[PDB]
C-alpha cells in the first residue's frame, strides 16, 4: 500500500509518498495566504497532479479540527480564509482512492503509538505542550475522532477554577497555566522581560521565581495526566512540543504525578517520533482504518 500523505500546517504544506512506513518524494510548499480559499483548491489540484497514479490512498493531517471532511476550529477565525474549507471534497475531485483526514496532534499521537507494543498498551495519550496545549487520544488501540473530530482537546479541560481565562472564554483551562503562551504572559512582565526559553534557563539555575512559573505549568500537566489515568484507564502518556521537551520539564511533571496516590500513575515519556510525525502518523492511521 502506497500512501499519498499531506500535512497542512498554518505556514507550510508538506506532501510525500509513504510506503512501508518509509517517506520518499518529500515536498513542501507555502500554505495559501492570498485569496486562501480559492488558492487552496488550486494547491490541492496541483499536489494531486504531481503524485497522480502513485498512491492507493490519501491521508491528510491538518491543524485545526476535521468535522466530517471540513476544516474548522474551536475559533474558526484562527484559520483565516480556510475556515470551513471543504478539504475532503476538494481532494476527492481529483482521485477515487479512499481519503482519510485527522488533525495534526491526532496524527502526531499516531506517530508515537504506531511503534508501541499494542498487546501491552491499548489506551494511549499524546500531549503536546508548545505555544498551546493539544492532545490525541487512543483507546482500545483506536484513535478517537467521532463524531465531530473534537476528541483530544484536553488543553481546554479545567486546571484551576481560580486560574487565568483561556483564549475562547473558559475560566481556568490547562492551556492558560501550562502552555508556552501562558508562561510568556508572565515572563514578559518581568523586569526585564524574558521569553519562555529564558525562564527555563533560569529555572535550571534554581531561580525561585522562574521555577515557580515552570512548576505552575508542569503541575497542571501532571493533574491532567492523573485525570486521564483515573478517568479513562490510560496506560501511557507521551509528551512533546517545545515546552514539553525542554530539559527538566518532564522530570518535574513526573515528580508531581508521583506524589499522588499510586493509582494515578502511568508510564510518562518524551515524544521520540516528532520527525515527519504528521505524515507518518496520518499514513499509519488511515491504513489502520482500512484494516
Ligand X SMILES: Nc1ncnc2c1ncn2[C@@H]1O[C@H](COP(=O)(O)OP(=O)(O)NP(=O)(O)O)[C@@H](O)[C@H]1O
Per rule CB under 8 A, is residue 217 in the interface with a second copy? no
Q: How far is Cα 171 from Cα 189, in angstroms, rounded to an integer?
A: 21
Q: How far is Cα 31 from Cα 107, in angstroms, rounded to an integer?
A: 18
Of the candidates 27, 106, 36, 113, the residue with the CA atom closest to the CA atom of residue 64: 106
The interface region with Ca ion, picked from 20-28, 88-96, 135-143, 164-172 by CB under 5 A, is 164-172
Per rule CB under 8 A, is residue 185 in the interface with a second copy? no
Of the candidates 150, 151, 102, the residue with the CA atom closest to the CA atom of residue 125: 151
Per rule CB under 6 A, is residue 198 in the interface with ligand X? no
Q: How far is Cα 60 from Cα 262, in angstroms, rounded to an integer?
A: 39
φ, ψ for residue 217, nearest 5 deg: -70, -50
Per rule CB under 6 A, is residue 131 in the interface with ligand X? yes
Site string for a second copy, 125-154 (x = CB under 8 A): ----------x-x-xx---x-xxxxxxxxx
In whole angstroms, the minimum distance from the beta carbon of 137 to a second copy comes to: 7
**168 grid coordinates:** 475562547
Per rule CB under 6 A, is residue 242 in the interface with ligand X? yes
In whole angstroms, the minimum distance from the beta carbon of 83 to a second copy comes to: 15
Per rule CB under 5 A, is residue 165 in the interface with Ca ion? no
Are 261 and 253 in contact, with CB atoms under 8 Å apart? Answer: no
Q: How far is Cα 49 from Cα 64, in angstroms, rounded to an integer?
A: 25
Q: Choose among ligand X, a second copy, Ca ion, none what residue 256 binds, the Cβ cut-off being 5 to 8 Å by kind.
A: none
| Interacting residues toward a second copy by CB under 8 A | 74, 122-123, 135, 137, 139-140, 144, 146-154, 156-162, 168-170, 219, 223, 226-227, 229-233, 235, 260-261, 263-264
| Interacting residues toward Ca ion by CB under 5 A | 166, 168-170
Amino acid at each position: 500500500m502506497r500512501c499519498l500523505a499531506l500535512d497542512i500546517g498554518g505556514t507550510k504544506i508538506a506532501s510525500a509518498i509513504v510506503t512501508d512506513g518509509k517517506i520518499e518524494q518529500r515536498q513542501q510548499i507555502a500554505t495559501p495566504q492570498a485569496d486562501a480559499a480559492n488558492a487552496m483548491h488550486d494547491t490541492l489540484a496541483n499536489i494531486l497532479a504531481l503524485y497522480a497514479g502513485q498512491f492507493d490512498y490519501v491521508a491528510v493531517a491538518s491543524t485545526g479540527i476535521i468535522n466530517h471532511g471540513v476544516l474548522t476550529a474551536l475559533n474558526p477565525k484562527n484559520l483565516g480564509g480556510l475556515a470551513e474549507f471543504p478539504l475532503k471534497e476538494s481532494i476527492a475531485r481529483h482521485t477515487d482512492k479512499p481519503i482519510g483526514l485527522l488533525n495534526d496532534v491526532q496524527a502526531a499521537a499516531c506517530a508515537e503509538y504506531k511503534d508501541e507494543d499494542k498487546n501491552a498498551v491499548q489506551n494511549f495519550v499524546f500531549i503536546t505542550v508548545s505555544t498551546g496545549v493539544g492532545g490525541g487520544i487512543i483507546l482500545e488501540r483506536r484513535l478517537l475522532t467521532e463524531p465531530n473530530g473534537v476528541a483530544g482537546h484536553i488543553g481546554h479541560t479545567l486546571a484551576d477554577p481560580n486560574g487565568p481565562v483561556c483564549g475562547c472564554g473558559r475560566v481556568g483551562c490547562v492551556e492558560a497555566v501550562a502552555a508556552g503562551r501562558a508562561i510568556e504572559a508572565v515572563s514578559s512582565q518581568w523586569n526585564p522581560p524574558c521569553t519562555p526559553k529564558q525562564a527555563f534557563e533560569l529555572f535550571r539555575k534554581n531561580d525561585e521565581k522562574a521555577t515557580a512559573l515552570i512548576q505552575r505549568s508542569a503541575s497542571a500537566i501532571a493533574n491532567l495526566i492523573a485525570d486521564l489515568v483515573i478517568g479513562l484507564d490510560v496506560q501511557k502518556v507521551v509528551v512533546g512540543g517545545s515546552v514539553g521537551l525542554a530539559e527538566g520539564y518532564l522530570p518535574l511533571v513526573k515528580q508531581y504525578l508521583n506524589t499522588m496516590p499510586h493509582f494515578y500513575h502511568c508510564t510518562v515519556e518524551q515524544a521520540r517520533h516528532g520527525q515527519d510525525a504528521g505524515l507518518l502518523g496520518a499514513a499509519w492511521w488511515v491504513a489502520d482504518c482500512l484494516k
